Amino acid sequence: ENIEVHMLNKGAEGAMVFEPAYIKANPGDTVTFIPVDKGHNVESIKDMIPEGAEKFKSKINENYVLTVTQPGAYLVKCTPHYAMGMIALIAVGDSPANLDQIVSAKKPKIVQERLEKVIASAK
Ligand SMILES: [Cu+2]
């Protein structure tokens, strides 16, 4: 199954966002990131993807198609806008084993704020 995500300068949660910022997927699915506005990309964050998963980084402004294989939670960022809160959480399979670890991990305050919103209301 494919899930489309838009990379925008401004959206419902404020500036620099992925929409949706919570993606539910199964092994084998793809996530397509579309640069609706210029200046964005997607990058996996170190130690915030599951054991066994490969790290990934797209180029700025390219349409990028991610195939997800390993179950667990993945926190991805937009490289230039991580400090401004531009992240998304991909949850592959049920009860992702590493989710609490990702919620507790060191990250910028605005990122933590948006992450907690997406898990609460966006779940
Ligand atoms: Cu960005």
Q: Which technique was the structure solved with, according to the deposited record?
A: X-ray
Asked if residue 79 lies in contact with residue 13, where contact means CB atoms within 8 angstroms, the answer is: no
Give the CATH number of the domain where residue 83 resides: 2.60.40.420
Query: Distance between CA atoms of 41 and 34, rounded to whole angstroms?
Result: 9
Q: What is the number of domains present in the chain?
A: 1
Question: 67 C-alpha to center of ligand 1: Å?
Answer: 20
Tokens 């200046």 sit on residue: 39
Question: 114 C-alpha to center of ligand 1: Å?
Answer: 15
Resolution in A: 1.6
The residue segments making up the domain with residue 22 are: 1-123
β partners of residue 31:
3, 66
Neighbours of 7 (CB within 10 A): 28
Any known ligand binding at 81? yes
Tokens of 41: 């990309």
Of the candidates 92, 81, 12, 16, the residue with the CA atom closest to the CA atom of residue 51: 92
Beta strands in the chain (DSSP E): 2-11, 14-19, 22-25, 30-35, 43-44, 64-67, 72-77, 87-92
CA distances from 78 to 7, 27, 39, 92 (A): 9, 23, 9, 20
Of the candidates 1, 34, 39, the residue with the CA atom closest to the CA atom of residue 20: 34
